[PDB]
Design a protein around this ligand. Structure first.
Ligand code: MN
Ligand code: MN
Ligand code: MN
Ligand code: MN
Length: 1178
């Protein structure tokens, strides 16, 4: 016997003896079958149990709901369960939910996720056939999807269901059946992993949730769909062999939705079922905001450098907002935590103190949201460093031998995290809670790096990935991840899908027509244009996110290229995501040969060439059409886009792989706000215009613009809307002239400038010189005979020439508190460039640099030596002052150039930060008396040192190491060096042996050594081997063979001491530093990772002390005699520039009117140093 459940759209006949459907009858009389045969199988823990009449009780709750109680028992196999099942119907949907599972053999999971004996681990209903179609029905067919990251291998299958179709639990991510005028897909929350087409990783790539099985049904073959098995209480083992039972992510759920000809195209196939399927499918959390995310990019910090503090990222948000006229953004903070990128894993709650900590991060996010910018952070749940407070013996993944599972060595040695322990112990969820306490509700997303690559365990399956995504989504965070194929269920972005350059054609986003038809609008997880990959990547009609960056990720810093790329691919891609696919025909990727014979070829659509139709909930219609399906035709890459029948884009996109400029032009109506994406005031609707080659094009305006007599057009730049033009509208059409690759925005009437207050929270207005030439009148005050300009078409800078002062009042200081102020400076002049903080005309603090001597090698930094500040190079380095905020609240910063030279000084990034450093002591006249540094208060970087060129422009393997005993100390595992010598922080060099060049160095702007003055330098150190690192002393820009070197002896696990004296060079440009020799390390018979983790190749420095010392006082005569002695030694040589230079300068000190004993002593000491130099001169 049976009962009927009923909605306005259908009646469903259900069996009383099992949660089975006999058939669905739609209002119009069309019928779809369920399970026409007596099948009553329940699987628990892999055992099939067939239920009899007495094993099932039934109750019809209402016309929309029935409840079943299933006794599921097999004594032999230790199964004794009672399963409650609910069937409900609404509209054209039927839901089947397991609402209760009672285990008669268990009291549940023991405390701390102990093993539950006889746990019900898996449950399914084999061959349940919730919906079915038959070989006897008209146009009976199946379409299924599996995961493919390979642009040349489609994930889909499309075939007719015939009497020969034979299939048993054939598994698919998605599965649709159609026949006799109806179509249905089956949805399930099953975490089952199964068959895939192509995927480089696990991590949820393999989730297959639908099982297709044929059975004989009278004289016909019936293809039925069932859910793949669900996990309930799964028992798992960690890397140490410890077992746990972990409760279900969610109770079992599944559903079907019955469609007729939903897109009204006269055929019934999976596309009709897919439209209905959107009403029942899981939707990734916060997938509704994806179409607003026009401007993705990464802002990077690394190696303690603070390349991108949070308030700077906010300013770059405002710059992008101006240049895009306020389109939404999604900024991925790679290195938001601890010392930067790939430091501090997995302490999710440790927000980078050198970046401004949680406070600046929150200010950035809160203010950024007003410009439609979302923020998210890069985390790692697979690898960790000793420095992280979460690092523990239980967190460590061990191999079967009991040794560490080592990760990557770079700044420090990474160690695998035991992924099963991290889940089952509650450790990972607790660290995400730490992060939640810091960010509250402000942060948009998590970016989970690497998950799926088997670094945390050999599984990382869909079950683990589902739990991972849930702990993230539970904190209000949208899920995003690295690998193109990963996390089909929950992820809304894959870095290796959106950045098309990575991985190659086998390793991209999801190459499936079914998946993209269903979810294009919900994810940036697809294949975009990158034609060298072929197939899916040759001009996809839907486009696809193409991600570039300008804030340091992999050295990327080209802002203009970033913006051009947004307009080339991303604006149209995002426009398209505002609509949902309703029809897709003539797909050239699908053939009879690749398992897709039943895909539609409609010769009456677009000449039988590919076309996709999309609609929104207001009935707007977008149609995207391929010029030709033949890849050797010029027309294969031609795309037309229409909006409500009107052409809004036409042509060939510049190749997404950078290889060939295109000719596409567009006039796209951007009808939505950058927030929840609602329609904007009819009066603030706008169109974006782009013309790849440049030139003149004519367009039909949207219907609501058709009666206007003119429009207003603005050219968009980094300053916002410029060059307003009034363009006549004639018969609803406009003609537009555009420079090539230049963005314009079109309004119905006059439009106001997006308001921007540069550098909120930064104590100064426009700290990064983003406000155009106007900033030097509106924000900064310029004075003097020289010249101040905002210079650079990329990351703009202050450029000074001649005698000029540029100043600005400081705001929002806490009176009586200590601050560092540092500014990037590159001085090409021989004259000094200075930074000064004054209060009431009185100097609080001041510092200066002569000609810069050290090029910038910091890859993630915006003015490194690959960025061309001037000539082939950049010498940008941070120049500091330290002051106490005055009680009267009156403080001013001045940036200046003194000399009347024609050469330039560059400044950028004025940073005022609370800072407790107080290790500099001056002499009466303001020269250096002493500088000490335990590195406990570094605002950023390895100050007073700067990183040198031993790795070129790199994410340099030098940073501030952090204490976390015992793991960071000698003696843990195979570690033989302490990371930290004193306090919590030291300067660490990792593995930079045999470079035969300078590793880092002081510079004059950081530590100035006065000409002829004498200084004692000392520090504590550890060094992994004898003579692998040396003290270097030099004057001016480093050059091979013009430095004094002193080899350092091994101090491995016990701290050594170094001290030496130096005499200031005559040009004030002396410096000392650490140098990597040509000597090989002694690895003490260590092999494998031990060679790196042992510390044999490393150098740690702490407790630096620099102090002026008393020199033996000299008379003028002694100095004069020393000149004679030196000239007697070397004037007869010549077998010399340095010599003559030092000599002239020494004689100046000697002969000056009013010279004193200090002058004579300096002259004498200068000549003694000249003597030592000259002994080993070229
Ligand atoms: Mn249809
Ligand atoms: Mn700048
Ligand atoms: Mn220290
Ligand atoms: Mn470290």
């Amino acid at each position: 016997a049976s009962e009927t459940l009923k909605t306005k759209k259908m009646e469903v006949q259900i069996k009383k003896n099992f949660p089975s459907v006999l058939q669905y009858t739609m209002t119009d009389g069309k019928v779809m079958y369920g399970q026409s045969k007596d099948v009553r199988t329940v699987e628990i823990n892999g055992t099939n149990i067939e239920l009899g009449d007495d094993d099932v009780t039934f109750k019809k709750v209402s016309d929309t709901e029935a409840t079943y109680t299933l006794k599921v028992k097999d004594e032999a196999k230790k199964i004794d369960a009672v399963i409650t099942v609910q069937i409900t119907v609404k509209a054209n949907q039927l839901h089947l939910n397991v609402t209760k599972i009672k285990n008669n053999l268990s009291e549940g999971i023991p405390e701390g996720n102990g093993v539950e004996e006889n746990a019900i681990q898996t449950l399914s209903f084999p061959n349940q056939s919730l919906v079915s179609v038959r070989s006897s029905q008209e146009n009976a067919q199946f379409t299924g999807a599996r995961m493919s990251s390979n642009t040349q291998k489609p994930g889909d299958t499309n075939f007719a269901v015939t009497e020969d179709t034979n299939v048993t639990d054939s598994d698919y991510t998605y599965g649709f059946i159609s026949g006799a005028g109806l179509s249905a897909g089956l949805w399930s929350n099953s975490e089952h992993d199964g068959t895939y087409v192509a995927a480089p990783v696990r991590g949820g790539s393999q989730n297959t949730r639908v099982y297709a099985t044929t059975q004989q049904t009278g004289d016909a073959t019936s293809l039925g769909l069932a859910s793949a098995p669900w996990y309930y209480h799964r028992t798992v083992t960690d890397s140490k062999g410890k077992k746990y039972t972990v409760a279900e992510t969610a109770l079992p759920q599944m559903a079907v939705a019955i469609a007729g000809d939903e897109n009204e195209d006269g055929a019934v196939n999976w596309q009709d079922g897919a439209i209905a399927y959107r009403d029942i499918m899981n939707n990734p959390y916060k997938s509704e905001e994806v179409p607003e995310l026009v401007a993705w990019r990464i802002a990077m910090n690394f190696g303690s450098q603070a390349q991108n503090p949070f308030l700077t990222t906010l300013d770059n948000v405002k710059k992008v907002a101006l240049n895009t006229d306020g389109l939404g953004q999604s900024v991925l903070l790679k290195g938001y935590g601890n010392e930067g990128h790939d430091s501090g894993h997995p302490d999710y709650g440790d927000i980078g103190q050198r970046l401004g900590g949680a406070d600046d991060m929150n200010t950035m996010m809160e203010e950024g949201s007003k410009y439609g910018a979302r923020f998210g952070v890069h985390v790692n749940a697979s690898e960790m460093y000793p420095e992280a407070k979460a690092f523990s013996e239980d967190m460590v993944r061990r191999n079967s031998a009991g040794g560490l599972s080592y990760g990557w060595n770079w700044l420090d040695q990474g160690v695998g995290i035991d992924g099963i322990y991290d889940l089952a112990s509650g450790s990972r969820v607790s660290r995400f809670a730490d992060l939640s306490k810091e960010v509250g509700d402000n942060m948009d997303f998590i970016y989970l790096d690497v998950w799926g690559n088997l670094t945390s365990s050999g599984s990382e399956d869909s079950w683990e990935t589902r739990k991972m995504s849930k702990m993230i989504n539970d904190n209000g965070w949208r899920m995003t991840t690295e690998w193109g194929s990963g996390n089909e269920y929950d992820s809304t972005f894959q870095h290796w899908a959106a950045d098309l350059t990575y991985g190659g054609y086998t390793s991209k986003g999801e190459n499936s027509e079914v998946m993209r038809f269903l979810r294009n609008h919900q994810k940036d997880s697809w294949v975009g244009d990158y034609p060298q990959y072929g197939g899916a990547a040759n001009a996809p009609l839907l486009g696809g996110y193409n991600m570039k960056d300008f804030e340091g990720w992999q050295g990327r810093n080209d802002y203009a290229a970033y913006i051009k790329n947004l307009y080339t691919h991303d604006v149209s891609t995002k426009f398209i995501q505002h609509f949902k696919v309703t029809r897709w025909v003539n797909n050239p990727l699908l053939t009879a040969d690749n398992g897709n014979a039943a895909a539609v070829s409609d010769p009456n659509t677009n000449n039988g060439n590919e076309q996709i139709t999309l609609k929104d909930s207001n009935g707007n219609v977008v149609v995207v059409s391929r010029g030709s399906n033949d890849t050797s035709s010029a027309a294969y890459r031609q795309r037309t886009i229409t909006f409500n029948g009107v052409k809004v884009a036409s042509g060939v996109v510049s190749a997404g792989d950078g290889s060939a400029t295109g000719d596409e032009s567009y006039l796209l109506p951007w009808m939505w706000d950058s927030f929840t994406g609602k329609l904007v005031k009819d009066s603030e609707q706008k169109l974006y215009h782009w013309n790849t080659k440049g030139g003149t094009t004519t367009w039909t305006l949207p219907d609501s613009w058709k009666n206007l007599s003119s429009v207003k057009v603005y050219q968009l730049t980094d300053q916002g809307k410029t060059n307003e033009q009034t363009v006549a509208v004639s018969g609803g059409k406009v003609t537009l002239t555009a420079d090539a690759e230049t963005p314009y925005v079109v309004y119905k009437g006059e439009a106001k400038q997006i308001q921007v207050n540069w550098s909120e929270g930064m104590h100064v207005v426009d700290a990064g010189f983003n406000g155009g030439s106007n900033t030097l009148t509106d924000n900064w005050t310029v004075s003097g005979s020289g010249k101040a300009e905002v210079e650079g078409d990329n990351n703009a800078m202050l450029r000074l020439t001649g005698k000029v002062d540029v100043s600005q009042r400081l705001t929002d200081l806490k009176a009586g508190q200590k601050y560092a102020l540092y500014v990037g400076v590159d001085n090409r002049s021989t004259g000094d460039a200075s930074v000064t903080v004054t209060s009431g005309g009185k100097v609080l603090a001041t510092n200066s640099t002569g000609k810069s001597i050290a090029k910038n090698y910091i890859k993630a930094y915006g003015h490194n030596t690959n960025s061309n500040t001037e000539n082939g190079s950049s010498y940008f380095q941070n120049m500091y002052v330290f002051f106490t905020a005055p009680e009267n609240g009156d403080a001013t910063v001045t940036l200046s150039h003194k000399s009347t030279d024609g050469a330039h000084t560059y400044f950028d990034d004025v940073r005022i930060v609370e800072n407790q450093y107080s290790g500099i002591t001056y002499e009466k006249d303001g020269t250096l008396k002493s500088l000490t540094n335990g590195f406990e208060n570094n605002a950023q970087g390895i100050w007073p040192f700067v990183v040198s060129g031993s790795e070129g422009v790199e994410d340099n393997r030098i940073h501030l190491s952090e204490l976390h005993a015992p793991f960071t100390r000698a003696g843990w595992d195979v570690k033989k060096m302490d990371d930290v010598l004193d306090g919590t922080w030291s300067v660490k060099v990792n593995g930079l042996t045999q470079k035969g060049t300078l590793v880092y160095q002081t510079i004059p702007q950081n530590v100035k050594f006065e000409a002829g003055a004498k200084y004692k330098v000392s520090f504590d150190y550890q060094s992994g081997s004898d003579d692998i690192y040396a003290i270097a002393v030099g004057q001016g820009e480093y050059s091979a063979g013009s430095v004094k070197l002193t080899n350092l002896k091994k101090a491995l696990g016990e701290t050594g001491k170094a001290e030496f004296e130096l005499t200031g060079g005559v040009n004030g440009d002396s410096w000392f530093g650490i140098y990597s020799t040509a000597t090989a390390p002694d690895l003490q018979g260590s092999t494998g990772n031990a060679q790196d983790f042992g510390g044999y190749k490393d150098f740690v420095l702490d407790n630096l002390k620099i102090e002026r010392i008393e020199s033996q006082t000299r008379t003028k005569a002694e100095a004069q005699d020393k000149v004679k002695e030196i000239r007697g030694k070397y004037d007869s040589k010549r077998a010399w520039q340095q010599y003559q230079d030092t000599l002239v300068k020494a004689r100046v000190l000697i002969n000056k009117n009013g010279a004193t004993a200090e002058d004579f002593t300096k002259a004498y000491d200068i000549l003694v140093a000249l003597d030592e130099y000259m002994k080993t001169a070229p």
